[PDB]
Design a protein around this ligand. Structure first.
Ligand code: JL5
Length: 151
């Protein structure tokens, strides 16, 4: 508890991944900073959908390599995301790439009837994001900066 950046990040990443996998928009209400989370989510729908479409084949090739079939395969993904994601280059571009690839994997977990792994995948992406990029994100004003960068 007492970590708004983490809680907001999970709300937004979790909601994007569920709605990308199922095509249904979450109606359950947003917590503190609702206005910023809704706008964050709206921006992911536009920018994250763009990355998935623009780079479908790069995304498909990686999903094919990672050979995700189950809960264990999702747990191995975290360490891959750390190696690729935490390497000293931080920008909203690569952050959207991370979250877009997550939604792409989430869609695949729906298609293979492994939708019980989507909430853990979201947690693992959130943990990689906030654990490894905390000071950059606070400098960029967190999700308010995200929305302002892409509006
Ligand atoms: C777990 C998969 C993930 S998490 C994540 N998070 C942020 N950015 C990523 O990648 C972009 C490039 C990028 C790739 C595809 C589309 C847009 C940008 C980047 O690192 O700066 C990735 C990738 C990622 C990384 C790669 N690589 C890995 C090895 N490097 C040397 C070459 C690019 C890749 O081919 C693909 Cl398809 C992805 C999805």
């Amino acid at each position: 508890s007492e970590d708004e950046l983490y809680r907001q990040s999970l709300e937004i990443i979790s909601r994007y991944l569920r709605e990308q996998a199922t095509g249904a928009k979450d109606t359950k209400p947003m917590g503190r900073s609702g206005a910023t989370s809704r706008k964050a989510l709206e921006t992911l729908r536009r920018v994250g959908d763009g990355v998935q479409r623009n780079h479908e084949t790069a995304f498909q090739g990686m999903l094919r390599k990672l050979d995700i079939k189950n809960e264990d395969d999702v747990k191995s993904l975290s360490r891959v995301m750390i190696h690729v994601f935490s390497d000293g280059v931080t920008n909203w571009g690569r952050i959207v790439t991370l979250i877009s690839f997550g939604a792409f994997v989430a869609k695949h977990l729906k298609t293979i009837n492994q939708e019980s792994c989507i909430e853990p995948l979201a947690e693992s992406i959130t943990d990689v994001l906030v654990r490894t990029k905390r000071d950059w994100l606070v400098k960029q004003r967190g999700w308010d900066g995200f929305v302002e960068f892409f509006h």
